[PDB]
Amino acid sequence: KIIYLASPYGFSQQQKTLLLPPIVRALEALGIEVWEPFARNNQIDFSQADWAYRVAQADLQDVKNCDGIFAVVNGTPPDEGVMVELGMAIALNKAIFLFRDDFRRCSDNERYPLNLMLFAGLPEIGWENYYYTSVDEIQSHDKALYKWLT
Amino acid sequence: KRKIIYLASPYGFSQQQKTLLLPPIVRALEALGIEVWEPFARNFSQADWAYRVAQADLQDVKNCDGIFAVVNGTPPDEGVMVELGMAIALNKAIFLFRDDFRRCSDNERYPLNLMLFAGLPEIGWENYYYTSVDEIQSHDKALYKWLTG
Amino acid sequence: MKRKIIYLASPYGFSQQQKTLLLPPIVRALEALGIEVWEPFARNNQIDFSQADWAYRVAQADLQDVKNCDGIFAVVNGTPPDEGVMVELGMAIALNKAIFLFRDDFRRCSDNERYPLNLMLFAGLPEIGWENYYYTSVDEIQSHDKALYKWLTG
């Protein structure tokens, strides 16, 4: 099972080094094969003008070929690149999992923590089971990633 | 039969912006003969109202012929980005609008995050990229060419 | 009899349409109170991506305007509010200028439940009655019951 790991964390040197590996490892510990686009497609700096299109199509192909997206949606607002990747995944009926350990709210509605469009690929009732608020919660057996694999 | 454009924007969140910014954009698009689906105009005390709105706009994106995405702001609005991502995966026509002179980018080719342009051609993507309301009418940009050619 | 000076901090000058359509109605609503409005994009001529030769002078001119104003009227629309406006608002707090905030955007971008935005934005406002300094529509600017009018006539 393949999870595309969409995040803004590859943009900060400290975040790329410290925040992503514990997330990657939590997902692998479930049995998941993890596609992390920043390393997988080598976007390590302000992309040169002649490599940007290639980087874009590579990330696009991974979203089309994965089985689920694990979208890190921290920030005010969530990262625009993550959001494009999230909309692709929804449109392609891929499995959808959201991660937000940022306690700030950035929402246009009183029902969801974020803009209601991010949850358009999640059920009306138990969308909370797909919404992870802590790295240590990724392992949880009562949450939709585990049940997705079992 | 008019081509259908879904007009994604954050302009419905501000009272003044909804009233003053969106009508001129709609008019410019309609002057091209387009049928405009503007989600704020298309749209309350219920519990499931947010879910129903998400499903309603999702249906509209699925059924449009193209998206015209207002990508002003730093960064572009996350709801527009989700809708733009849907439109790219569903092979809809893609047009971007930004009259904001600020750059919010991860690369030197594009003035925005490169994934916003992933559904556009490698060369000539500028022809789909509108930088002023006055430019929407241009017979030399992709919207007119797509309506005719 | 010198008019009171309001510095109108906003991100609206970055967008051609916003600059042309959103700012003049706000300027008028303030001028209708007898206020002299300092709108930095027009005053200090930041009309496109500033050339390198010029960005320092734009910064110092806006900075000096904040120093010389009597109050700041901060457009704090957006998720999150604009970083330039926020710098100009922090300056105005520190310099004991009058503070008024404008947000007609109904989205919330906050780190707390007491205030609709980041808590620091209200650090220069009283603990009780801060809502009086927080405007949520251009039409509300005129309110003889809100803080801007009371500051002018007080």
Next chain:
Amino acid sequence: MKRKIIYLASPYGFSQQQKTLLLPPIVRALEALGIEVWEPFARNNQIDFSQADWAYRVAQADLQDVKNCDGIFAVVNGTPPDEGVMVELGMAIALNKAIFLFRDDFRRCSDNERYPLNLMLFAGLPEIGWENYYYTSVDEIQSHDKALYKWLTG
């Protein structure tokens, strides 16, 4: 070298994983220089979506810390930089405080070709040599020929 007080403004206390993993190495880097670090999340206890009757005290405590510090070390990562950091940075500029910026985020969020961010962030810096106060990595906080080090002496 003198034991100056640095206010470490950042958005990193908002995320559980960032508060735990990203702040301590930055605090330790500043403390390796002999600086007294005032980190507002720990020091004024903002740990979650703040309770309404506590929010005003948090704002006033962070404001007082900015008033009583010697300089600000502003984490200005993100698109755009955090509005709370930006308010606290505007205060520091107007309060005559030493100004140090850092960003290891390689994205651009700018209104000008001279600076990688909104030009107002760099207003309290000099026209020539602002790069001195701009740290793009954590190994660079150490460096004796940047701004922090030199300020700690003269």
